Design a protein around this ligand. Structure first.
Ligand SMILES: O=C(O)c1cc2c(s1)-c1ccc(F)cc1CC2
Length: 258
C-alpha cells in the first residue's frame, strides 16, 4: 500500500550512518535491477508496474522537521517531495510520467506541479548559483531539509528551494549513482566540512547518461567512441572501456544493446 521508505537524519549523522543510508537507497533502487553484468542496470521504464516504480526517502534534521523525497527507480532521480499536507512535483516530460506521479502521496490535501523540470541547468537558474558555488555536506543538507519543509508554510522562497534541491539531489541521487560521489560526501562528513563539488564531481554528474550508453553499447567492454571526464584539478582525460568505471559508477539507466 506504500512504496519502500528509507530514513536518514542529519542529527548526529556519521560516516557510518550516511554509508548505511546510501547502501539502503542503492538496495531499494536495485530490487528490480539487472545485476548480471559488470555494473547494475536500473529497471527499464517500459512495462514497469506502477507499484514498483518509486521509492521514498524520508529526511529529518536536528530541528526534527521531516520531508519525503520520491525517487524514480528507473533513473534514481528525485521527481517530487512531500512536506506536511502538501506534495510538490517537477514538471513531467510526458503524459505517462504525469500519470505515474498521481500514484505518489495520494493522501495529501494539496498537490502542486512546478512549471519547471528538475534538471541542474534549470535549478541553477532558479537558485541563482551554479553547482560549483553551492556547498555540500551535513550542514548544507540540514539547512536544505528545513528549507524544503518551510516551503509548504510560505517561509522559503523559490531560489532557496532550488538550491536545496541541488543539495539533496547530489547527496542522495548522485551519491547512489556513483561510488565516487558517495566517497566525496563521506570525506565531507568525516572532517565536518562543507564545500562545493570540484570539477570531477560535476563532470561525472553531467556524464551519467552518456556513460550509461557507452557502457551498455560496449563490445567486449570496449567503447565505440571515448567519453571525456575530469580530474579534481579540472584536467581532462578519456575513458575507453567499462572495467575502469566499475569502481566509479554504481547504477545505470537502462539503455538498449545492439
Ligand atoms: O582527481 C583525480 O586524480 C581523479 C579524478 C577522477 C579520476 S582520477 C577517475 C579515473 C578513471 C575513471 F574511469 C573515472 C574517474 C572519476 C574522476
Amino acid at each position: 500500500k506504500q512504496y519502500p521508505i528509507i530514513n536518514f537524519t542529519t542529527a548526529g549523522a556519521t560516516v557510518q550512518s550516511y554509508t548505511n543510508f546510501i547502501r539502503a537507497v542503492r538496495g531499494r533502487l536495485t530490487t528490480g535491477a539487472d545485476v548480471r553484468h559488470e555494473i547494475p542496470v536500473l529497471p527499464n521504464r517500459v512495462g514497469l508496474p506502477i507499484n514498483q516504480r518509486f521509492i521514498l526517502v524520508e529526511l529529518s534534521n536536528h530541528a526534527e522537521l521531516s520531508v519525503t523525497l520520491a525517487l524514480d527507480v528507473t533513473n534514481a532521480y528525485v521527481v517530487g517531495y512531500r512536506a506536511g499536507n502538501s506534495a510538490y512535483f517537477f514538471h513531467p516530460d510526458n503524459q505517462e510520467d504525469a500519470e505515474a506521479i498521481t500514484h505518489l502521496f495520494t493522501d495529501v490535501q494539496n498537490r502542486y506541479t512546478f512549471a519547471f523540470g528538475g534538471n541542474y541547468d534549470r535549478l541553477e537558474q532558479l537558485a541563482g548559483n551554479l553547482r560549483e558555488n553551492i556547498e555540500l555536506g551535513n550542514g548544507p543538507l540540514e539547512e536544505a531539509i528545513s528549507a524544503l519543509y518551510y516551503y509548504s508554510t510560505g517561509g522559503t522562497q523559490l531560489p532557496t528551494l532550488a538550491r536545496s534541491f541541488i543539495i539533496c539531489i547530489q547527496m542522495i541521487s548522485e551519491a547512489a549513482r556513483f561510488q565516487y560521489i558517495e566517497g566525496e560526501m563521506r570525506t565531507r562528513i568525516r572532517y565536518n566540512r562543507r564545500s562545493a563539488p570540484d570539477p570531477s564531481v560535476i563532470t561525472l554528474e553531467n556524464s551519467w547518461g552518456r556513460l550509461s550508453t557507452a557502457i551498455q553499447e560496449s563490445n567486449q567492454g570496449a567503447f565505440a567512441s571515448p567519453i571525456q571526464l575530469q580530474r579534481r584539478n579540472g584536467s581532462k582525460f578519456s575513458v575507453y572501456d567499462v572495467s575502469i568505471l566499475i569502481p566509479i559508477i554504481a547504477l545505470m539507466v537502462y539503455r538498449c544493446a545492439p
